[PDB]
Amino acid sequence: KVFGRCELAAAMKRHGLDNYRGYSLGNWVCAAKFESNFNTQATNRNTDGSTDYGILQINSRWWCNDGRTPGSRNLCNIPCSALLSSDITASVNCAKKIVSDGNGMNAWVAWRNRCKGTDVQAWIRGCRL
Ligand SMILES: CC(=O)N[C@@H]1[C@@H](O)[C@H](O[C@@H]2O[C@H](CO)[C@@H](O)[C@H](O)[C@H]2NC(C)=O)[C@@H](CO)O[C@H]1O
């Protein structure tokens, strides 16, 4: 799918990410443009061999079951193909769980560099919320 700026991320507040679990709603929208550039089907493999899945860019090494990751935990317990589709209705349980780990975005790579220390209200600015 192809989402516009104000139309891909108005659903995070619908999923309870608004100020969810120590991270405020404003710190969220910026990174998604930095992981898959507002596109749900952009997936990539990694030189760790663990293939990533979705605009979330999650890999089967630690987080899910793609059948090609042995010694993989899949503590998330769902098909990695379970998030690339148009509907993402449940897709947020692991984004949420991936934070209770006590690390937060410590797993997210781009935000820590591209969105960390940035002007975030600018990313969520002008839209209605
Ligand atoms: C923009 C983009 O797709 N970035 C990729 C990152 O998502 C990804 O980062 C992390 O890789 C680590 C393993 O090498 C894991 O901690 C983790 O699964 C993954 N991001 C998470 C889950 O937060 C790397 C590695 O595939 O590729 C970047 O390009």
What separation in Å is there between the alpha carbon of 59 and the centre of ligand 1?
7
Domain membership of residue 20 as a residue range: 1-129
Residue nearest to atom 1 of ligand 1 (CA): 35
Q: Residues 63, 36: contact at Cβ < 8 Å?
A: no
Q: How many domains does the structure of the chain reveal?
A: 1
Quick one: three-class SS letters along 15-79? CCCCCCCCCCHHHCHHHHHHHCCCECCCCCCCCCCCCEECCCCEECCCCCECCCCCCCCCCCCCE
Resolution (Å) of this entry: 3.0
Question: Candidates 109, 111, 113: which one to mutate for ligand 1, based on the most atoms within 8 Å of Cβ?
Answer: 109
CATH of the domain at 85: 1.10.530.10
